[PDB]
Paper text:
KdpFABC is a high-affinity prokaryotic K+ uptake system that forms a functional chimera between a channel-like subunit (KdpA) and a P-type ATPase (KdpB). The heterotetrametric KdpFABC complex comprises four subunits, namely the channel-like KdpA, a member of the superfamily of K+ transporters (SKT), the P-type ATPase KdpB, the lipid-like stabilizer KdpF, and KdpC, whose function is still unknown. At high K+ levels, KdpFABC needs to be inhibited to prevent excessive K+ accumulation to the point of toxicity. This is achieved by a phosphorylation of the serine residue in the TGES162 motif in the A domain of the pump subunit KdpB (KdpBS162-P).
To further investigate the role of the tight state in the conformational cycle of KdpFABC, we prepared a cryo-EM sample of KdpFABS162-P/D307NC under nucleotide-free conditions.
Author numbering:
A (entry chain D): 1 to 27
B (entry chain B): 7 to 682
C (entry chain C): 1 to 190
D (entry chain A): 1 to 557
Write the structure that this text describes.
């Protein structure tokens, strides 16, 4: 919707991608 | 290790502020908390400025408590590594190292120029004379004497480093009050196990075990599902009315993520490794640390005698007429050649009863014979009265060979010792008996029910020994092991290890001599012996500083305690989320769905206070569980199903009941103190 | 992978087995063993059909045993659009519909009990259901008796003749086949 | 009504176990690559004719075989539905489906979900419902049983690489398990009154004087495999409550038995193949306790149904709205829980017209992963991920290494088990979130408020968890809904099949240690309760907020 919704969606997607990468590559 | 020293805690408060994202990147479970803390801090700053509507104080308190949570997790982790570093450099014994004199030839009298640590290498020779700290590890060559090995053991008891014998290896710097003993530095300083342990604790090189990274994978999966559940509440509640504010979503997220185990996992690992370091065992890898508690078959091996039994407590009562000072001197001189923990504790208790300590062994040039399991009777040979000690039957055979008899007083004293419960040991000057000493049992019955508990865990304890088979059966009967193997060749030992590993069972082995190196190299767990060889020390992966082969069961206990602590805290952090829901969900939806107040199982004050109390509890539970993570769980040896039942009854019910009480008490405190 | 001929071969064989011969075998076995059950269970009166014994029909006459409401599309009992109204208990539209049905049934049944059965006011799962409980069927026998000049015991005997029960009472409910009961009423009147 | 429900559950479970134990004994032979008695001799010549040579292949080739068969079925079903009016057996001359609906009901039928956003009595033709729907109802079920066969073989094989032949397994399943049972079930349905014919639609002059059109078609042959394969793809719009499709309470009982048949049979076969039946007993107890609790809760919440019915002038407050008459409230509640927990899209009672609390428990069983007698094979390898998590947690409790059935479970299997656990609730939450922002997703609402959000959440979880049961009030024939749900079904089946086969390929490489006293007993009431607590806690901690904003809000409103 608005800019807040867009930046929330991108923040949640970035955190989800970071956690997926962490699960795939267990450092 | 009082677990809260003033200097350690203040340096911890100094060093916990290193919470930059470059160091929080490697932990995703708490990088989520850090990102949420920064996001809510920006939101609170925006509300204070006036860019968005709000109250700018509830969000600020939530931000401060989330920062307090991440600071508490870093507090726990850095406390564990600080305690590990303190223990490591406390057991470090290089210290001054400002006097390392050289020797030209291996003979008394050479160029003794004292230069401080002038690049000592493997194969060099140095000298110490009445007070000089040992420069580097090696083997004594000629004229060895009594040294005060404390920097590697923790006891101020005198231990002789006999030249050309079992007591050849010297470990680290120590105190020497006699003189004229030559050693040969067979290794360079830096590749020793002490230096490797120092280099491993001095830095961030603390690479996690495979089971640890599996646990982090589970924590990351829980983090992903909780992040999705909290992030999808904005459309779900935004359609039904006003949208749920972002700070409540972030606070519910942080209350949902397994923050307890996610911040205490590194603390658990480092605390367990430091606990095993405090058990006089130095390891080289956390994988080996966990594999120690992961064994199924246990090998208790030494090239010489075995005599599995501690019997540390003693009484030292002749009731004869000869004074206890000379009794203790006799026992100390007889047991100075004994590397067993029984003789070591006899010397320790004699020292702490009367200050004998150094005895000037080179005064009479005594020849030393070690303990023999085939005779169970040994001593030294100062003069014609060859003073000796041993078991009752062996000393009776000795005194009948020498032409003597047992006095009725010492017979009654042996009877009293046997009735009270001990193994009667008596020292004899070689021509006339002095008095029996007691070896009081360790805790309840000692090694026998400890092995019974280990077999109740389904852990095989195979007796390995090098003496004859007839005495090995008696030693096995005294210890409590199910089966034995005597005079085993190294090829047969390696074949037995490969046969036990062929079915998949992990193996743990003790080893001293250089002939045990091929077995210890391919063994899953290889605890070396300081009474053995440096070659075997480097071949193995763990070093025992007490020179006791019975410490393997304690190492197994520590390795199991680490895993039990990990699982218990993981299940506690998972089960806390039920009360987190019962505190947050009826209060998060206050203006969207006003009918969602019947789910408030706890009569909480306000929606603005329920989430705040939940976040306060989520912050405080890490501090309240720091002592649990440092100590480990209460280890009760039982059947595996019984341990599962006990751990469930404690920790699952704790996760299902303790957060209810904690959140209720925190909300009650907030209401009676007027913060909310 | 590199194996594609076995994949296509077994897919063609499994298609030709699961569709085709298996429906053909089931069809020939059904039409050989159970006619009037494999064909639609139609009730026939000679070169015509009055509907099946299973689907159910929209009955609104005064002398007919009324069934459950249906709430299908474009017609009350329309087999071309199955599935009843998916109104929740929280929907006020369902409350309005139930209130209207209760008012209509109470107006149409002056000499019966004011407690309307749930069967006659709640729409069925499918809109096609010629089944009501015998209590709901006996709830309507004063109106049918008044509109058809029949006896209460005669209507009860007709219902009990046209009521079907399961093998055990707890895997289902006793039901009354509405369509053939009304057809039996028509034949009894004629 | 308290004793009738208990007797119903008791006799259902008793007849189910009695019927399913011999089927488990039969399925153990197919798992152990042993031909069935009498099927040999013709099996070899059939394999020689079809071109399969019993090539023992690994997990990658097995997965590629299953996936290639599924995409071939998807392509042929999509083309069959697009070019429907060119095909024969179309007495009503129905036009070809639109692209969105055709793709939706092609991916839906291939991915063993059988979501139906249409009305089959006036949407699809006889040839379509004969050779594209029944074929995929057989093939998706056979694919699920083949994947669970691979998983059980991986658990039971010692230090190998191969995992059997996928084509041989599929042929064995759908020729000696599915068809011989579905034939008897279809013939019994025909005898009870279900339809099996190819006549055109019969024009009916009713008693009153109006006209209605009765739809015919091969209904019973489709319905037999629809029940047996836990499929739920109905011939008509009323998915399993049509009198031409579920005519008798005896037919309903056979339907429930067929729905739980192959899950229970596969649990028994898993117990038998290891040689230790206690593992299958453990799995069956862990499923059955949750199943009985859920059935009791739903029965009580439906008996204490509509509160407005008692005060609005009716006789009792029982919830009979959206329920049939030949099947009672208790029977409809039991069927709802059976189909919804078993990943079967069959509905007798319209789940949208349920009580909020009585419809929350089916959707809870749906959102915890189809593990309580779930799916057809798919429930069994969805159950062995919670089992792997349980043995991991219990191993950390007891201090030993995490292992199950004598096989060590390492970091790679933790990665794959975590991903397979993650994939379906992620799909439910993101799909519901996407549907609750778009106006095209929020315009399909029928009931207003928390029940409408429950409708959207139920539809998304039905697509993602491969169930097919629907809150039928949602108008999901929109292109956005069709594409979103088709994507959800596709990736929610093939993001569980792939990690489970990777787990199988990891498990074949290891060998089982001997069960010493140090290994915890995986059977027993302790581990049954631990596994139940694990699956309930994992499925609850990820969906309590959604349930609170949906059916709990509707119940407390
Ligand atoms: C209101 C709630 C109150 C709770 C009610 C209490 C209900 C408890 C369960 C009832 C009976 C279950 C078994 C009891 C023995 C336990 C031992 C065991 O492990 O079971 C194996 C049991 C005994 O076999 P075994 O001695 O191990 O034989 C070894 C063989 O080598 C290997 O062969 P096998 O193991 O495959 O089977 C061998 C079989 C030979 O093979 C066969 O004949 C075919 C397979 C077995 C058929 C039997 C079916 C039994 C299972 C379901 C029965 C209905 C329960 C539903 C009621 C629950 C509440 C609604 O011969 C037997 O020994 C079978 C006898 C089993 C019991 C007899 C039938 C029970 C009558 C109905 C009871 C109804 C409740 C009455 C209580 C009233 C209280 C208010 O066999 C089986 O039942 C096979 C199935 C495998 C286990 C699954 C069982 C699931 C349980 C269903 C209910 C779960 C919910 C209960 C709690 C409610 C929620 C909190
Ligand atoms: C929240 C955490 C808090 C923890 C609380 C509990 C934790 C420890 C449990 C111990 C409590 C002791 C209670 C008294 C014992 C008497 C009952 C009995 O015989 O069962 C022995 C059993 C211990 O088994 P065991 O020591 O391995 O000995 C095995 C022998 O076969 C035992 O047999 P036996 O030699 O004693 O006598 C033979 C015979 C005769 O037994 C007797 O002499 C006594 C008669 C009773 C019949 C036994 C079957 C029923 C037992 C359980 C009853 C319901 C308990 C539910 C309440 C939960 C809290 C206690 O019993 C049988 O084995 C025949 C049954 C055939 C086996 C088939 C499996 C049946 C399953 C039935 C339902 C199981 C649980 C239901 C769901 C619970 C979900 C929470 O104790 C139980 O009652 C276990 C059930 C309690 C639940 C366990 C786990 C709870 C935590 C959930 C997980 C949450 C954590 C978070 C997840 C992870 C993160 C995601
Ligand atoms: K998980
Ligand atoms: K927590
Ligand atoms: K399905
Ligand atoms: K459906
Ligand atoms: K799942
Ligand atoms: K699935
Ligand atoms: K889940």
């Amino acid at each position: 919707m608005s800019a807040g919704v867009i930046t929330g969606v991108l923040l949640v997607f970035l955190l989800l991608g970071y956690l997926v990468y962490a699960l795939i590559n267990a450092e | 290790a009082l677990f809260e020293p003033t200097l350690v805690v203040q340096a911890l408060k100094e060093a916990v502020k290193k919470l930059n994202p470059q160091a929080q990147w490697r932990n995703p479970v708490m990088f989520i908390v850090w990102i949420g803390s920064l996001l809510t801090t920006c939101i609170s700053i925006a509300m204070a400025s006036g860019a968005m509507p709000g109250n700018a104080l509830f969000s600020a308190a939530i931000s401060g408590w989330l920062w307090i949570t991440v600071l508490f997790a870093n507090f726990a982790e850095a406390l564990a590594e600080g305690r590990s570093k303190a223990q490591a450099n406390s057991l470090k014994g290089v210290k001054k190292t400002a006097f390392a004199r050289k020797l030209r030839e291996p003979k008394y009298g050479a160029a003794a120029d004292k230069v401080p640590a002038d690049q000592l290498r493997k194969g060099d020779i140095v000298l110490v004379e009445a007070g000089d700290i040992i420069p580097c590890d090696g083997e004594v060559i000629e004229g060895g004497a009594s040294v005060d090995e404390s920097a590697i053991t923790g006891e101020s008891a005198p231990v002789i480093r006999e030249s050309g014998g079992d007591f050849a290896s010297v470990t680290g710097g120590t105190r020497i009050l006699s003189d004229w003993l030559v050693i040969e530095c067979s290794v360079n300083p830096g590749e020793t196990f002490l230096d490797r342990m120092i280099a491993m604790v001095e830095g961030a090189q603390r690479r996690k075990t495979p089971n640890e990274i599996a646990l982090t994978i589970l924590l990351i999966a829980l983090t992903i599902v909780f992040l999705l559940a909290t992030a999808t509440l904005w459309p779900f509640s935004a359609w039904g009315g006003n949208a749920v504010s972002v700070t409540v979503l972030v606070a519910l997220l942080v209350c949902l993520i397994p923050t307890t185990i996610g911040g205490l996992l590194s603390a658990i690992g480092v605390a367990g490794m430091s606990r095993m370091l405090g058990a006089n065992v130095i390891a080289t890898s956390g994988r080996a640390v966990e594999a120690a508690g992961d064994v199924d078959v246990l090998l208790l091996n030494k090239t010489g005698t075995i005599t599995l039994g501690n019997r540390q407590a003693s009484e030292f009562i002749p009731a004869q007429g000869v004074d206890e000072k000379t009794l203790a001197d006799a026992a100390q001189l007889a047991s100075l050649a004994d590397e067993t923990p029984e003789g070591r504790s006899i010397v320790i208790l004699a020292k702490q009863r009367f200050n004998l300590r150094e005895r000037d062994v080179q005064s009479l040039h005594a020849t030393f014979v070690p303990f023999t399991a085939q005779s169970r009777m040994s001593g030294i040979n100062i003069d014609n009265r060859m003073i000796r000690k041993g078991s009752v039957d062996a000393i009776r055979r000795h005194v009948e060979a020498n032409g003597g008899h047992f006095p009725t007083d010492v017979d009654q004293k042996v009877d009293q010792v046997a009735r009270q419960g001990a193994t009667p040991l008596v020292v004899v000057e070689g021509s006339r008996v002095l008095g029996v000493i007691a070896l009081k049992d360790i805790v309840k019955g000692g090694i026998k029910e400890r092995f019974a508990q280990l077999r109740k865990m389904g852990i095989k304890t195979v007796m390995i020994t090098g003496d004859n088979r007839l005495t090995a059966a008696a030693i096995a009967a005294e210890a409590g092991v199910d089966d034995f193997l005597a005079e085993a060749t190294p090829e047969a030992k390696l074949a037995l290890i490969r046969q036990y590993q062929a079915e998949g069972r992990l193996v743990a082995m003790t080893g001293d001599g250089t002939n045990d190196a091929p077995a210890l190299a391919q063994a899953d767990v290889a605890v070396a012996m300081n009474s053995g060889t440096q070659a075997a020390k480097e071949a193995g992966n763990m070093v025992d500083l007490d020179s006791n082969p019975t410490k393997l069961i304690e190492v197994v206990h520590i390795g199991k305690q680490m895993l039990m602590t990990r699982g218990s805290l993981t299940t506690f952090s998972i089960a806390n989320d039920v009360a987190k829901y019962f505190a947050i969900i009826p209060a998060a939806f206050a203006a969207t769905y006003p009918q969602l107040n019947a789910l408030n199982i706890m009569c909480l004050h306000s929606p603005d206070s329920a989430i705040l109390s939940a976040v306060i509890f989520n912050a405080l539970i890490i501090v309240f569980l720091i002592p649990l993570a440092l100590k480990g769980v209460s280890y009760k040896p039982l059947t595996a199903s019984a341990m599962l039942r006990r751990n469930l009854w404690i920790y699952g019910l704790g996760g299902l009941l303790v957060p209810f009480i904690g959140i209720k008490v925190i909300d009650l405190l907030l209401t009676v103190c007027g913060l909310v | 992978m590199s194996g594609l001929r076995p994949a296509l071969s077994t897919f063609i064989f499994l298609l030709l087995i699961t569709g085709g011969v298996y429906p053909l075998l089931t069809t020939v076995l059904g039409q050989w063993w159970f006619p009037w059950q494999a064909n639609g269970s139609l009730i026939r009166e000679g070169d015509t059909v009055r509907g099946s014994a299973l689907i159910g029909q929209n009955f609104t006459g005064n002398g007919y045993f009324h069934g459950r409401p249906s709430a299908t599309a474009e017609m009350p009992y329309n087999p071309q659009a199955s599935g009843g109204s998916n109104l929740a208990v929280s929907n006020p539209e369902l409350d309005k519909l139930i209130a209207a049905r209760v008012a209509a049934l109470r107006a149409a049944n002056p000499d019966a009990s004011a407690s309307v059965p749930v069967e006659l006011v709640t729409a069925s799962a499918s809109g096609l259901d010629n089944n009501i409980t015998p209590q709901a069927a006996a709830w309507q026998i004063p109106r049918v008796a008044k509109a058809r000049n029949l006896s209460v015991e005669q209507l009860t005997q007709l219902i009990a003749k046209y009521s079907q029960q399961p093998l055990v009472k707890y895997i289902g409910q006793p039901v009354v086949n509405i369509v053939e009961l009304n057809l039996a009423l028509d034949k009894l009147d004629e | 009504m308290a004793a009738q429900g208990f007797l119903l559950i008791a006799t259902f479970l008793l007849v189910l176990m009695v019927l399913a134990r011999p089927l488990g004994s039969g399925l153990a032979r197919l798992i152990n690559d042993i031909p069935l008695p009498g099927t040999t001799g013709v099996e070899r010549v059939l394999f020689r004719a079809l071109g399969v040579s019993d090539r023992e292949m690994n997990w990658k080739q097995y997965l590629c075989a299953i996936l290639g068969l599924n995409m071939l079925g998807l392509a042929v079903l999509f083309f069959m539905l697009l070019g429907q009016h060119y095909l024969p057996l179309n007495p009503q001359q129905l036009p070809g489906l639109s692209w969105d609906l055709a793709l939706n009901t092609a991916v839906s039928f291939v991915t063993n979900t059988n979501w139906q956003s249409y009305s089959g009595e006036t949407t699809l033709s006889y040839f379509s419902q004969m050779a594209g729907l029944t074929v995929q109802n057989f093939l998706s079920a056979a694919s699920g049983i083949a994947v669970i066969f691979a998983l059980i073989r991986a658990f039971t094989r010692q230090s190998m690489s191969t995992l059997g032949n996928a084509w041989v397994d599929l042929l064995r399943i759908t020729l000696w398990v599915l068809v011989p049972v579905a034939l008897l079930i279809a013939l019994f349905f025909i005898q009870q009154g279900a339809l099996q014919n190819f006549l055109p639609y019969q024009a009916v002059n009713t008693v009153e004087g109006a006209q209605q059109l009765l739809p015919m078609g091969p209904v019973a042959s489709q319905e037999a495999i629809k029940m047996l394969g836990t499929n739920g793809g109905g011939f008509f719009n009323a998915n399993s409550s049509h009198p031409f499709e579920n005519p008798t309470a005896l037919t309903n009982f056979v339907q429930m038995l067929a729905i739980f048949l192959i899950p229970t049979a596969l649990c028994f076969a898993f117990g038998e193949v290891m040689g230790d039946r206690r593992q299958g007993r453990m799995l069956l107890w862990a499923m059955s306790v949750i199943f009985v609790i859920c059935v009791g809760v739903v029965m009580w919440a439906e008996v204490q149904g509509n509160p407005h019915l008692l005060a609005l002038g009716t006789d009792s407050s029982i919830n009979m709205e959206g329920k049939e008459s030949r099947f009672g409230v208790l029977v409809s509640s039991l069927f709802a829980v059976v189909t919804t927990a078993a990943s079967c899209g069959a509905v007798i009672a319209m789940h949208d017209s349920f009580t909020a609390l009585g419809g929350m428990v089916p959707m809870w069983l749906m959102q915890i992963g189809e593990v309580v007698f779930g799916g057809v094979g798919s429930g069994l390898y969805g159950m062995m991920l919670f089992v792997l998590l349980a043995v991991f947690i219990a191993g950390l409790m007891i201090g030993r290494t995490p292992e199950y059935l004598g096989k060590k479970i390492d970091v790679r299997e933790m990665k794959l088990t975590a991903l397979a656990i993650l994939v379906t609730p992620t799909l439910v939450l993101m799909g519901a979130a996407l549907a609750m922002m778009t106006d095209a997703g929020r315009s399909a609402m029928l009931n207003p408020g928390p029940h409408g959000f429950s409708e959207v959440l139920y539809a998304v979880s039905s697509a993602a968890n491969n169930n097919g049961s629907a809150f039928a009030g949602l108008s999901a024939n929109s292109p956005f809904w069709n594409c979103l749900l088709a994507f959800c079904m596709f990736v929610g089946r093939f993001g569980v099949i792939i990690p489970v086969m990777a787990i199988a390929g990891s498990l074949v490489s290891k060998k089982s240690q001997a069960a010493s006293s140090g290994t915890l007993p995986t059977h027993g009431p302790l581990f049954v309760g631990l596994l139940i607590g694990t699956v309930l806690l994992v499925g609850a901690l990820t969906f309590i907020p959604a349930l609170a904003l949906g059916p709990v809000a509707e119940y407390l409103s």
